Design a protein around this ligand. Structure first.
Ligand SMILES: *[C@@H]1O[C@H](CO)[C@@H](O[C@@H]2O[C@H](CO)[C@@H](O[C@@H]3O[C@H](CO[C@H]4O[C@H](CO)[C@@H](O)[C@H](O)[C@@H]4O)[C@@H](O)[C@H](O[C@H]4O[C@H](CO)[C@@H](O)[C@H](O)[C@@H]4O)[C@@H]3O)[C@H](O)[C@H]2NC(C)=O)[C@H](O)[C@H]1NC(C)=O
Ligand SMILES: *[C@@H]1O[C@H](CO)[C@@H](O[C@@H]2O[C@H](CO)[C@@H](O)[C@H](O)[C@H]2NC(C)=O)[C@H](O)[C@H]1NC(C)=O
Length: 312
């Protein structure tokens, strides 16, 4: 049990109003304890020497147990595969790539809410980019269709799923609707797919070999943003800026629990990194993005990467 100082208290009061919270007197006390505990972890981290900084955000009054139950996958997915189809060509590759800068090729940052549906945002993000790169038309595709309808490809709505499986669903389903006709609800609903309203389509699915991080480099450089999954741990939730890395996350496919979208890569002070779009809204991290160290299979990010070839 912590002794909470008045600085922490006054900041928790502001945080509650900013995030529109109400607590009973008895839950307020437990929430304040978690907030103060995170406050000190953030300060202790930022006051030391690290390649990334932490900060307060929408998760700051939650324990990681609660975060995991509400926001991350509730079960491991079938990330491990003994077969793939992507075969890498030859380097070297550009020193840095950023599909956000090449043109209008990356959609705005979205918010998955209290639902483990990040695999659906990773999927729509990758396909939105692919269609924009191929046609100059930037769409916004319906994550909720994947949440509600993609179960025949071993996806599980708000419990989790995989981009490669979702790309196959879109391929065999003959398309995905837009956000405009199938709006996002942040919970498991009834499938409302209408064939004549599909606006995005998949021709092929590229699966990158397990641990083949260099093929990810090539695919981002040459073709498309790349969907991938990694293991989120407690420190990552409070990521603010810089190059994320961790010595406690695992690197294996059975431990990944969060899907995202690599939109580029670079290097800073000798440290290679990935530029990654998240789905926790534009005020998380670096305007909704994070950097994560490249070349080390960091947190298992090279375990099951994939991207689509659009039918246009
Ligand atoms: C990259 O990674 C992904 C994800 O793991 C792999 O995805 C699998 O992809 C295969 C295709 O390569 C998918 O299999 C196909 O599914 C279609 C739909 O199946 C449903 O509907 C049929 C009725 O139409 C039901 O019988 C079935 O039980 C499902 O409910 C089928 O229409 C396909 O059948 C056609 O091709 C097969 C080839 O085996 C023939 O046997 C058939 O006669 C028919 O012509 C086919 O079965 C599979 O669903 C995907 N799995 C998942 C979990 O998403 C990719 O394979 C992988 N890519 C590579 C290259 O490895
Ligand atoms: C991982 O893949 C396996 C094999 O495709 C899935 O197991 C199948 O699950 C379906 C639906 O639950 C059953 O109808 C099949 O009989 C199962 N087959 C086998 C061989 O077990 C499994 O559900 C997938 N796991 C996840 C998390 O999606």
């Amino acid at each position: 049990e912590l002794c909470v100082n008045s600085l922490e208290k006054f900041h928790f009061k502001s945080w509650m109003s900013k995030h529109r919270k109400t607590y009973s007197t008895e839950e307020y006390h437990h929430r304040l304890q978690t907030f103060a505990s995170n406050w000190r972890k953030i300060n202790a981290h930022n006051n030391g020497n690290h390649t990334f900084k932490m900060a307060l955000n929408q998760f700051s009054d939650m324990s990681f147990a609660e975060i995991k139950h509400k926001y991350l996958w509730s079960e491991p997915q079938n990330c491990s595969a003994t077969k793939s189809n992507y075969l890498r060509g030859t380097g070297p590759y550009p020193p840095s790539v950023d599909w956000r800068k090449k043109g209008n090729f990356v959609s705005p940052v979205k918010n998955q809410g209290a639902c483990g549906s990040c695999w659906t945002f990773s999927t729509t993000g990758a396909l939105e980019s692919a269609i924009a790169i191929a046609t100059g038309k930037m769409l916004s595709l319906a994550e909720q269709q994947l949440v509600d309808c993609a179960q025949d490809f071993n996806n599980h709505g708000c419990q989790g799923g995989l981009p490669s499986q979702a790309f196959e669903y879109i391929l065999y389903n003959k398309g995905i609707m837009g956000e405009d006709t199938y709006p996002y609800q942040g919970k498991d609903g009834y499938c409302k797919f209408q064939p004549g309203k599909a606006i995005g389509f998949v021709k092929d699915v590229a699966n990158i070999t397990i641990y083949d991080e260099e093929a990810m480099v090539e695919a981002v450089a040459l073709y498309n943003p790349v969907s991938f999954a990694f293991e989120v741990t407690q420190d990552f939730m409070m990521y603010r800026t810089g190059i994320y890395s961790s010595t406690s996350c695992h690197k294996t496919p059975d431990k990944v629990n969060h899907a995202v979208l690599a939109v580029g890569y670079g290097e800073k002070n000798g440290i290679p990194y990935w530029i990654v779009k998240n789905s926790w809204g534009p005020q998380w991290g670096m305007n909704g993005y994070f950097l994560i160290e490249r070349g080390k299979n960091m947190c298992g990010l090279a375990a099951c990467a994939s991207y689509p070839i659009p039918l246009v």
